Design a binder for this molecule. Structure first.
Ligand SMILES: Nc1[nH]c(=O)nc2c1ncn2[C@H]1C[C@H](O)[C@@H](COP(=O)(O)O)O1
Ligand SMILES: [Mn+2]
Ligand SMILES: [Mn+2]
Ligand SMILES: [Mn+2]
Length: 156
């Protein structure tokens, strides 16, 4: 039994492209990823996801839809990362570089998997297919998966 900390992950997914952010600092720096961060006290998970999207990309959206949940375990870290994954296709501003993230659009036949977290190669395809998923990944460091589980679900 480990304890877990709540995080969000937000993918702006349109019919032919996806918005990713190049992490400029901190955890996972140098990788393209969705936008997000720790959920704060007093906010719902969805509202934390909306806040992090605004802070890191400049985009303000009224609503997100939950598409997945992924638990990350790191060797040597007793605390699990409980990551709630959200999507939307509906935006109405331009992405803006923040201190944390540089946003960039990618065509959906140019998803930059080699420069994303290794786990994304497994669950991102389900997201593209509009399937919901539960995942778990145990990492040695930032590059090596020692164990993982991925399942399509009907309810996240
Ligand atoms: N293995 C992984 N794969 C992934 O796609 N995103 C991850 C991840 N591990 C952490 N993240 C995301 C979850 C959060 O959005 C962010 C971590 O929080 P901050 O470093 O505070 O932004 O990175
Ligand atoms: Mn953040
Ligand atoms: Mn934060
Ligand atoms: Mn963040």
């Amino acid at each position: 039994m480990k304890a877990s900390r709540l995080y969000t992950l937000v993918l702006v997914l349109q019919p032919q492209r996806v918005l990713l952010g190049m992490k400029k600092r901190g955890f996972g720096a140098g990788r393209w990823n969705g936008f997000g961060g720790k959920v704060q006290e007093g906010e719902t998970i969805e509202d934390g996801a909306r806040r992090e999207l605004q802070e890191e990309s400049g985009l303000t959206v009224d609503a997100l839809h939950k598409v997945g949940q992924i638990v990350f375990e790191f060797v040597g870290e007793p605390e699990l990362m409980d990551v709630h994954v959200f999507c939307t296709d509906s935006i109405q501003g331009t992405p803006v570089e923040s201190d944390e993230m540089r946003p960039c659009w990618f065509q959906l036949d140019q998803i930059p998997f080699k420069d994303m977290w290794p786990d994304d190669s497994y669950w991102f395809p389900l997201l593209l297919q509009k399937k919901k998923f539960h995942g778990y990944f145990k990492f040695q460091g930032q590059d090596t998966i020692l164990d993982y589980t991925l399942r399509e679900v009907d309810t996240v």
